[PDB]
């Protein structure tokens, strides 16, 4: 026998009460709110009613911690999930209600991640509405589109084309560079930040686009809309199982019939319902190769990603890896593999987990060619794992609205007292920037915009091309 410790007292099943909830229903901090079964008690020694067990210690107060990710948190401690803080006041977490900024994506050649979060498979070869606002009963501001060619089977083929239609404009991009076919009216909101491996691209107060120069399309929207959009990315409502509402206003179950509803050209070819299987074409009846690809896609579950695997589930981003690089016949460029992992590392970076997964025998990404135009090798460009995308330059000296915390790619780093310009590849002292300050106030480096349309009598316009301290005369309407 053993006389149990002082802090608790022994119990005895009474012969009358069936409700002998004693030793069997030992209330710990997990199972207090939970309701328990019990036949009869036992010859144990249970804590008093005013306290509970806690890891071989009958913690007295009802102050015991508030678990998340299987980790302790004392009362008062906070956690940051998304753009919200949250503190378990008593015994439940107490979170804010600031809805965060959602993000489409195109992980690989043929996959799509909606705003609310829904990976699905859609191999197409026509042009498709990725997201828009002219949906049902709305004005119809922007109509981002996407268009693929030779991309039903992922390979070194499948260059994407993207035509974004905002403010009566037509700016589009493919083959590395961005092209303006029709400039839009309010040029003030326009912006282009070619920082690193990406093309960050703002379009307004509540819209942004990102493009890795190869395939990815990550449009970022703000809290403004909240069920005002539709397209292949869904409606942005929080409900995660109504992101397959086709153009004909009904939910479908098979995504290959969904995106066929969103094609622009209603007379091109609608894609074919593929017979479902775990092995794509190359990995079909090639079980040897199917394992060499599976193992190499376990880099997504490796010692270097262990921090992020607890935050972001890798199972979506692994299914894309096995799908793409089976179908892809990678020969000279191993980009259909190295781009599916970078898409996972960037999502890990947005949640504050910078990662260095890239070595010399795996997806090297040199940066030595930018340090070549000068005969003297100054060596300022470097591959930095995740550096800020929104910095100050001769072309964009002011700080911009920054939808992306940091990004991969080649970044120019040199000692302070020098600021980067892209035309002259190196960094240069600030005075060499064509910066503009007309009549005193601080603004950009001479944007090509006609300020002050509102009042005729106060039409006091002052442009600046590069350096000139000039002001132009307004043409009177009379």
> Distance between CA atoms of 298 and 279, rounded to whole angstroms?
17
- 248: tokens are 């004909």
For ligand NAG, the closer CB: 89 or 138: 89
Q: By Cβ distance, which residue is nearest to ligand NAG?
A: 89
- Choose the contact partner of 39 out of another protein, ligand NAG, Ca ion, none; CB within 5 to 8 A by kind: another protein
- The verdict on 239 binding another protein (CB under 8 A) reads no
- The verdict on 302 binding ligand NAG (CB under 6 A) reads no
For ligand NAG, the closer CB: 78 or 179: 78
* Contact range with another protein by CB under 8 A, out of 22-30, 35-43, 127-135, 180-188: 35-43
For Ca ion, the closer CB: 239 or 264: 239
- The verdict on 94 binding ligand NAG (CB under 6 A) reads yes
- The verdict on 97 binding ligand NAG (CB under 6 A) reads no
- Choose the contact partner of 35 out of ligand NAG, another protein, Ca ion, none; CB within 5 to 8 A by kind: another protein
Q: How far apart are the first and last CA of the chain?
A: 108
Contact 310, 69 (CB under 8 A): yes
Place of tokens 């960037």: 346
Contact 451, 462 (CB under 8 A): yes
- The verdict on 37 binding another protein (CB under 8 A) reads yes
CB of 154 to Ca ion, least distance (A): 26
* Contact range with another protein by CB under 8 A, out of 33-41, 324-332, 357-365, 375-383: 33-41
- The verdict on 77 binding ligand NAG (CB under 6 A) reads no
Contact 47, 58 (CB under 8 A): yes
Q: Which of 17, 31, 43, 89 binds ligand NAG (CB under 6 A)?
A: 89
Q: Which of 9, 39, 264, 281 binds another protein (CB under 8 A)?
A: 39
- The verdict on 96 binding ligand NAG (CB under 6 A) reads no
Local structure of 210: helix, strand or coil: coil
- The verdict on 175 binding another protein (CB under 8 A) reads no
Residues facing residue 148 across a β-bridge: 160
For another protein, the closer CB: 39 or 362: 39
Contact 105, 114 (CB under 8 A): no
- The verdict on 472 binding ligand NAG (CB under 6 A) reads no
Contact 36, 25 (CB under 8 A): yes
Query: Using a CB cutoff of 8 Å and minimum separation of 24, what contacts does 381-384 make?
Result: 381/410, 381/411, 381/412, 381/413, 381/425, 382/410, 382/411, 382/412, 382/413, 383/358, 383/408, 383/409, 383/410, 383/411, 384/196, 384/408, 384/409, 384/410, 384/411, 384/413
Closest CA to 248 of 260, 234, 261, 239: 261
Site size with another protein, rule: CB under 8 A: 3
**Residues interacting with another protein, by CB under 8 A?**
35, 37, 39
**Residues interacting with ligand NAG, by CB under 6 A?**
89-90, 92, 94
């Amino acid at each position: 026998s053993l006389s149990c410790r002082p802090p608790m007292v022994k119990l005895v099943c009474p012969a009358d009460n069936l409700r002998a909830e004693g030793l069997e229903c030992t209330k710990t901090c997990q199972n207090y709110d939970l309701e328990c079964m019990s036949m009869g008690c036992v010859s144990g020694c249970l804590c008093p009613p005013g306290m509970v067990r806690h890891e071989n210690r009958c913690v007295a107060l009802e102050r015991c911690p508030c678990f998340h990710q299987g980790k302790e948190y004392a009362p008062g401690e906070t956690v940051k999930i998304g753009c919200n803080t949250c503190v378990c006041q008593d015994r439940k977490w107490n979170c804010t209600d600031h809805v965060c900024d959602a993000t489409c994506s195109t992980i690989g050649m043929a996959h799509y991640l909606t705003f609310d979060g829904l990976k699905y498979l859609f191999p197409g070869e026509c042009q498709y509405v990725l997201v828009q606002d002219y949906c049902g009963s709305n004005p119809g501001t922007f109509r981002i589109l996407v268009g693929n060619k030779g991309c039903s089977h992922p390979s070194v083929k499948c260059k994407k084309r993207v035509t974004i239609l905002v403010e009566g404009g037509e700016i589009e991009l493919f083959d590395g560079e961005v092209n303006v076919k029709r400039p839009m009216k309010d040029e003030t909101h326009f912006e282009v930040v070619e920082s690193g491996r990406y093309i960050i691209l703002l379009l307004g107060k509540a819209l942004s686009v990102v493009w890795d120069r190869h395939l990815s399309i990550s449009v970022v929207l703000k809290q403004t809309y909240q069920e005002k959009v539709c397209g292949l990315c869904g409606n942005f409502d929080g409900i995660q199982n109504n992101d397959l509402t086709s153009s004909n206003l009904q939910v479908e179950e098979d995504p290959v019939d969904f995106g066929n509803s969103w094609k622009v050209s209603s007379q091109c070819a609608d894609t074919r319902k593929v017979p479902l299987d775990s092995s794509p074409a190359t990995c079909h009846n090639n079980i040897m190769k199917q394992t060499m690809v599976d193992s190499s896609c376990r880099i997504l579950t490796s010692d270097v990603f262990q921090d992020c695997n607890k935050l972001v589930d890798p199972e979506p981003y692994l299914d894309v890896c096995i799908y793409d690089t089976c179908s892809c016949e990678s020969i000279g460029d191993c980009a259909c593999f190295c781009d599916t992992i970078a898409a996972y590392a960037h999502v890990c970076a947005q949640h504050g987990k910078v990662v260095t997964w890239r070595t010399a025998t795996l997806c090297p990404q040199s940066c030595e060619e930018r340090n070549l135009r000068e005969n003297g090798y100054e060596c300022e460009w470097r591959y930095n794992s995740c550096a800020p995308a929104c910095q100050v330059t001769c072309q964009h000296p002011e700080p911009l609205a920054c939808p992306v915390q940091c990004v991969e790619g080649c970044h120019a780093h040199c000692p302070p007292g020098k600021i980067l310009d892209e035309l002259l590849q190196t960094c240069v002292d600030p005075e060499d920037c064509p910066v503009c300050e007309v009549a005193g106030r601080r603004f950009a480096s001479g944007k090509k915009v006609t300020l002050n349309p509102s009042d005729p009598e106060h039409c006091q316009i002052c442009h600046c091309d590069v350096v000139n301290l000039t002001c132009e005369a307004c043409q009177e309407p009379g």
